[PDB]
Amino acid sequence: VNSFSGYLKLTDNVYIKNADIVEEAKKVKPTVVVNAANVYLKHGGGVAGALNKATNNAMQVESDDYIATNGPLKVGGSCVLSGHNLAKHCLHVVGPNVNKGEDIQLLKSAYENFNQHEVLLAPLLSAGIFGADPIHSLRVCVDTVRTNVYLAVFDKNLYDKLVSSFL
Ligand SMILES: NS(=O)(=O)c1ccc(C(=O)O)cc1
Asked: Any idea where the Macro domain is?
């Protein structure tokens, strides 16, 4: 048993809810929250900027030190950093950004990072400003992630479409 509430079960291991991932993280304080990161860990908009804003910019300060030491992530890659006031850990995962021309086949590699963690709160990857089709992202998630993932979908209209079209 875990603390996640109000989710619709899609599969053995994937759950979904219409929720603001920031508000969900603040309530649950999960072991792992996933950030929809870019390779520079520049948390400017969407989930990364909202997560970073909710940490009072501490996520960005930590991230800048990580990049100064290690250089950029790979598209499809990840790093584990602090969860600050939102979670124990934040798993920063880089899905391909369609609006920058990245290979959508890298979306499966991105979701494979989730399998290193038993339970995660996470948004769909490559959605919103990354330019991928969220229906596709949910299908790759279900077909790739084997650990228990709790998906927060901000947009109520999209949530309803994801559920009603789910195979
Ligand atoms: N890639 S993003 O611009 O941060 C993004 C991620 C998820 C949602 C959503 O749940 O609706 C919206 C935008």
From this structure: 1-167
Coil/strand/helix, residue 85: coil
Domain residues of the chain, as ranges? 1-167
Q: Distances from the Cα of 14 to the Cαs of 9, 34, 139, in angstroms? A: 6, 14, 11
Is 93 near ligand 1, meaning CB less than 6 Å away? no
123 ligand 1 Cβ < 6 A: yes
Element (H, E) at 22: helix 21-28
Containing 112, the helix (H) or strand (E) segment is helix 106-112
Residue 90's identity, in one-letter code, is: C
Determined by which method? Answer: X-ray
Q: Entry resolution in angstroms? A: 1.0
